[PDB]
Design a protein around this nucleic acid. Sequence first.
DNA 1: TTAGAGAATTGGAGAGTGTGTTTTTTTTTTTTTTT
DNA 2: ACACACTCTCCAATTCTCTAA
Lengths: 364, 51, 92, 567, 81, 656
Amino acid sequence: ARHSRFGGLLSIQTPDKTRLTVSGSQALVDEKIALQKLDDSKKWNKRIIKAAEGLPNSLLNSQTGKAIFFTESNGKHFKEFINNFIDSGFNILLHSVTNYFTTEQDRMVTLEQVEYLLFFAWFVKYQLLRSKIDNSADIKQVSEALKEVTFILVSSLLRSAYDLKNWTVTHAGMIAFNELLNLVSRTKAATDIEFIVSRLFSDERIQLLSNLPKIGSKYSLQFMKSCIELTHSVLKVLEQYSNFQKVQANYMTEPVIETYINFLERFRELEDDSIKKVFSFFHRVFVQAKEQALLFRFDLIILLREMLSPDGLDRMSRSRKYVSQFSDYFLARLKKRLKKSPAWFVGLLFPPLHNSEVGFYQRY
Amino acid sequence: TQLGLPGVKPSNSGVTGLRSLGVRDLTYKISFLACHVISIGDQEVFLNSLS
Amino acid sequence: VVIEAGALMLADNGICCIDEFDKMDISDQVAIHEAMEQQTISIAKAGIHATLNARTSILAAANPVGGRYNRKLSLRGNLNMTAPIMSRFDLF
Amino acid sequence: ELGTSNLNLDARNLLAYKQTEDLYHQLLNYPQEVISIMDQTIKDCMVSLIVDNNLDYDLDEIETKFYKVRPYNVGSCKGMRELNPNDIDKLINLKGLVLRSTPVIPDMKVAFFKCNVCDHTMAVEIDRGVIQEPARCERIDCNEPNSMSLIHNRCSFADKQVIKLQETPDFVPDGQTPHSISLCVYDELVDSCRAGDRIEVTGTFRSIPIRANSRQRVLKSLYKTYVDVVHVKKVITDQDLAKIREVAAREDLYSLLARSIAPSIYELEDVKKGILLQLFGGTNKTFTKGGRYRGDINILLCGDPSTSKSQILQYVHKITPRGVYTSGKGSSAVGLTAYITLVLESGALVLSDGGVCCIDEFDKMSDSTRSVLHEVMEQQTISIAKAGIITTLNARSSILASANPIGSRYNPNLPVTENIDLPPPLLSRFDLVYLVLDKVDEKNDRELAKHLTNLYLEDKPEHISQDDVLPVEFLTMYISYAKEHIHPIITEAAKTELVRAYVGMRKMTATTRQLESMIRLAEAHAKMKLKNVVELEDVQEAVRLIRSAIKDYATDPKTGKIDMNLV
Amino acid sequence: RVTLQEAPGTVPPGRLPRHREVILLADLVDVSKPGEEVEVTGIYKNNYDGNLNAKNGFPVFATIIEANSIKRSWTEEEERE
Amino acid sequence: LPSIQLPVDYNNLFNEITDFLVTFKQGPKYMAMLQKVANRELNSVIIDLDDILQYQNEKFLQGTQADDLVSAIQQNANHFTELFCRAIDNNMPLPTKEIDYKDDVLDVILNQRRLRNERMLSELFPPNLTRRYFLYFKPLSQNCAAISSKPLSVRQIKGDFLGQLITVRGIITRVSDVKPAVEVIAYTCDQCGYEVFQEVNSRTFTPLSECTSEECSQNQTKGQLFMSTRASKFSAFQECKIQELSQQVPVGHIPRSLNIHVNGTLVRSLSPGDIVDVTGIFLPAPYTGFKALKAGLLTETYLEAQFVRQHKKKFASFSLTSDVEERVMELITSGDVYNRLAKSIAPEIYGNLDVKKALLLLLVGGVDKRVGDGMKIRGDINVCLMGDPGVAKSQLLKAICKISPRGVYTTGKGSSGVGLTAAVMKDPVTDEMILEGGALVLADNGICCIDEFDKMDESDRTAIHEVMEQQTISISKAGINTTLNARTSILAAANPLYGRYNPRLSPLDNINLPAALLSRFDILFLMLDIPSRDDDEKLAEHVTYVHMHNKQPDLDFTPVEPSKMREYIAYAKTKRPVMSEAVNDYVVQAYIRLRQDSKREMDSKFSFGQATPRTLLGIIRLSQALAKLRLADMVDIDDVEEALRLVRVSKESLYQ
DNA sequence: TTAGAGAATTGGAGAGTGTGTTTTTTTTTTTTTTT
DNA sequence: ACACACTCTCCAATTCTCTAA
Ligand SMILES: Nc1ncnc2c1ncn2[C@@H]1O[C@H](COP(=O)(O)OP(=O)(O)NP(=O)(O)O)[C@@H](O)[C@H]1O
Ligand SMILES: Nc1ncnc2c1ncn2[C@@H]1O[C@H](COP(=O)(O)OP(=O)(O)NP(=O)(O)O)[C@@H](O)[C@H]1O
Ligand SMILES: [Mg+2]
Ligand SMILES: [Mg+2]
Ligand SMILES: [Zn+2]
Ligand SMILES: [Zn+2]
């Protein structure tokens, strides 16, 4: 309220009678602010590490929460052009271009790979959205994507890209393979499609699709987001297959959880929808699978304060419903654990301990 | 004058700690940035002017 | 000099009102006389020279000497004003 | 419910309640911290009222506002010269007179930064005068050095002003001249006070270093000192209205008020009455066209020495809310009106606007200086036209003047106008002119001698000239209220009497100004009775007082001399 | 260098006259005397000035005129007449 | 680089100092003072060099050698302020009474800092930070005496004296207002929560900006320092200037001056216009920084004040110690003080006894009065002397100028009404307007003497009108609008019109003063030079004796000296005697008679104008002055009849 | 799957270098010589 | 010579990669 040179001085005394000094008039009354302001003065930050080059701007290396803007005549003319394209051209175009590339895959160049995978993705998604909206549209228009040859080809691109550690094609292939699965769940909600699933979920591919979130921890914010959305779809299909317990245990371990938190803490930049996806996964880890020991780690506990405070997530966004309903249960189970075995106070700082004789009792 | 103006040396207390100032001190003045002005203080031209 | 305009400049193509004219110093009455003679003002000092136009009509008020007019005397006897200035009013 | 943000608090209440007896001392010893604590207490209490009593008011609105306490009546006042280095950062109380105020200065409170490459933005808090500029741009993917920059016109500022306060003459050392101190004032209180105001303040007494040069951090050993004010005070109820209306119903009201403006002065009743009507004043009038007409009355007191004229000017100078006392040999033409310094500055008649200007030894100042008063008295405006400045200023100022005749004692062998000796254009501008004469008479002299000698029968006298007089405070209340709420109008009957009376004085010298001054005096008389109309009685009193002041009944109508035997 | 001012007949009523400054080079020096009424052709030119910027507080440039030319007997028939 | 031997070792002198502080007595003298310091009752210690001289003599008479500490601290005074302070700090006793220690911020800070060090372990701060006292030296008594006892004029202060302790005589020209000066500055470090101090001696300093503490450094904690007032130490500072007396300036030269500095409890002792014996330490003022490199070897200089002696005790400084009591009892027991005191004014002037009695009542004066409604009435008395040439008017006037502790002398031709009252001067180079008071302001609460009152211009004399009756000055000029205080009594002298008084005309024709001014004097005395073989012989015999012996001739009468006279008058100006009803009736009846007699004789050769109401209050003022001189608390009718006689006698010179 | 041995990239400590610094009115109160 | 602004340089702290138990 009063000006910048009126300010007095504050002293704060710890246990063991040692004292600190902070300035400003709000520190007199708000200890939370004083504690935060105290640490904020300190100089150092640890310096930091950093995936894609050689190609024009696209979804792969830009934040796409930023539209481009249409006149009304332009909006309707563009809608007319691609709607007639889809109703008229899409299957005949994809059938030709795919049965080319199966005969020519060895000779490819990075751009043609990234074109094919981001033409597939766009048109399949747009049609799903259009028929979600209205009954005049139908899914049969995009149905060339599912037949067996194209499925093999998207698979093969993703495979070869992953092995040679080419991360941009791997990123695009992740986006294409996401949509194919999304389209399958649509069609199952209506014969050969189950055959296609069974071939899509041979054990080899589960090894790959399980592997993929683990490496995401290092890379850019989009890569991790692709990993999350693909994982959500991948598990949801296999939930409605009915094997399942083998597959879910395959996913749950430290390096996946690391990625989830590392992505979640940049929530100021993300959508309302993506956080719904992350907490869905934590509900799966914590309540259903009953693998509670993964999340007792300190940088999660910081996060829930920031995001839940009057600082961050809005008092009325749908996110706070999910977050506060999660944290309540979290702290109840944590209370129970800590009073039953006091060693976890020193546990909470560090990774869990992989020794055979003590580790089993540690995790449970 | 207290900023890095080429060819001129530096010249109720101001504000400080900004990069360009170094150890110097900065103050401000209030003025009005207008966009138009209107005053309120041949017979043929005059007659055409009237209603 | 400060050059900035005086009263006679603001009253160009206008009426300039002088109240209690008889109280004005002679050293300044002569300045008004010189301006009224030419409808022009001149500046020359400190290396700066200027000439300005003063097409202004004057309206003045004054007190008779001793506060009350004397019917025994001419207006010249009654008024504390020099003859060249008095010669330049159209109406009294 | 009034939508307002500041709470007054006289500190004595902290001593009455047992739980805060020590908080009173802590307030004086640690103002910056304690006042902040009080602020954040008040705001929380305001929130608690609406949420506990579950009222309709917007919680967001109350959360948005700032609330501030303003403590006052802290203790004894302190002499400006007696503040010592052991008083630094404690609360202080001062009395004084305002000289001048600087224009409002913008003071920064929040800084605004923008990234030059990626257009990220940050708002930063200012404390202790230093901007806490970021080292690197804080956007994760744009972690670059020297990348942020300040945008001046998107910052947030606050108002600061500096007031110059002067020592009151009551405290100055023997054989010395008064000193002054500077007050820093912020936000609400910024434009509160004008030149010539008389105030009491409350604030922290601060000190700060000053730099040797603008290039480097080198400080001087002497420290600057100033005051940081948190409250300002100038030096209604139905009971007050009941008292005022009841007093106004008394039969002896006019004599009661008149003898109560200057209680210890013996007789001089007509002089006191005229001064009372000057205090009330006429009515101010403004037309759509044809101008504005002054409500103020000008008075001249002229006569023999020792007659107690200057003693009366003391009472008027202390009764009036605004005003000045001065002397003839003490005043220049510039000092009396306004001064070029490039800026313009105020003189006595401008500081006295809306009040009374007392001028003593009026017969000593030169014709050059007195000629300045013609325009100000007639128009109540001051026109100026000098190098670089040309303007007109308002001066709603009432003059009360004191003089002695030519030859320094009234000479009965000369006519009255020749004894007074002011020129006619200036003598025509006074509403009332009084002759007061040192006439010998044993009856008068015994009473005067008994009155003056009675003051020495006690060390600090309780004695006073009359049994029933009003206290100064209540009398001030009456006059102030009557000036604000009452606005008399001319009745047709009053119009007929004024025309008749003017023709009577005219046909025989009465000028046209005698008519207007009669109207103004009658209006002043009407306000003093809390009437809304001027009546025949008021007109006749205005006429009677004019005839009485200049001893007209004793005047030879043809020769203009006064028969001293008739006095 | 020469200072040039508006002729009093050209100045509108109730306004002060304006000024400009002219630079004269090799052949043109002392072509004119103070108080003469003169006519000038030249380039209109500007440059940075620190003091103007410092006093006004805006990026304001100063201007000058570089003159290219400057302007202001009898026959036997007259003698015979 | 090089070094020398010198005859002084400071260890021996330190031992002498610590013995002196614990042993000397007139218990020991200085230990009582240090107990008062420890109790927080006393703020300053004044060391007397007469004590050190006495101590040296006593130690010598006991048969032992000792160093001459008195000359040692006069020759190099600056260093011994530190030695005495260290000795006092070493030997300071413990408090006798409870203090409420928690009122001190420095105590809390240092206690917590000590506790931090105690915990950490499981000079600290400069000693100047906890010296609650000030210390000053007082020079040798000249009657015991050495240079510090002998006053110097401001010309005699050569460059030889730099560093020494000296005494200076002169007039003060101007005084600054008080402002704080730092001694020890205090800072706080944000990250490590630790405090550091800095000490300032020079006129300028650089503040600290890095926490160089070893613990903070070893934690690699590059924290930020911030300044704090609440634990810094300040001291009061004031600066003045002194200038040589005008009657000591050698012909054709311009007067010189010195800069004086004042710190501690000695502040606001000096005032402008005082004649004073200042004593202190004379020092140079070195330059700092880049300026020093190109200033050269010429040094600025100033005087550190230590003690101040005034020449005349102001009446406001009086208090009745029994030393003064014993002396006023001499006059009281001897009796008839009115005649003795009047006869004692200017004994070298013969006769004129009633004039001297009137001037004694001028020195005493009436009682100030202030009524419950805010009216106030003049207490001062105004007197005028009107007479022929050669009757000792200027001489008697200038004699009274010596007795009064505040007073000024002025003559009518040498004086402007402005400079006599107050002036608005455009004095600085900055075009600022400043008010500067005139002679009547410098004579505030004193007497103002105006000689040749008849030569002063008629217009300028009007400036005095406001001051005479209202005791104040009012000015309204360019940029200045204020009232000043001028509580001054005026004494004036004049010749009648045409010089020697003319009996052909009335007294009012000869006097030639306007009515408004003639009324403002409470007494106007008329004195004429009329030959007489008998009186001329007696006067000549008296004056010739005085020229022969430098002494007034005496057989019976001993005058009281001016000092004891000042003590009696100063004691008498405290009494405020009240009137009574019996007295009031008498003066009320007297006043009527005066005005009736005036009315009867306004036509007459014996006229002197008309009695106004200001003649009644003149009687009351003279009566109350007479009541003060007899140390009463009650006016008596005996006073009133004398007050009337003293007014009547002024006119008898008209009757040869 | 852990861990330890070797290589590459980056930060800023701190040392060094050059630099800048002292220093014609126009309006208004007052004294003085001039008509 | 005394605070500053700016440039240059070296050294070790750090993370990344490869190998074998
Ligand atoms: N009627 C009266 N009532 C009270 N005091 C009076 C009266 N008449 C005279 N006096 C006293 O006489 C003195 C008058 O002083 P003052 O007020 O200066 O009178 P004045 O009219 O101004 N005379 P002067 O200044 O010489 O023109 C004061 O002490 C008054 O108290
Ligand atoms: N009664 C006296 N006793 C002693 N000396 C006297 C006496 N009367 C006159 N004188 C001498 O007269 C001389 C002149 O005195 P002074 O005071 O100058 O006179 P004055 O009254 O001021 N005359 P003036 O200035 O011309 O009006 C001095 O030397 C005195 O000593
Ligand atoms: Mg008076
Ligand atoms: Mg003399
Ligand atoms: Zn950025
Ligand atoms: Zn530190």
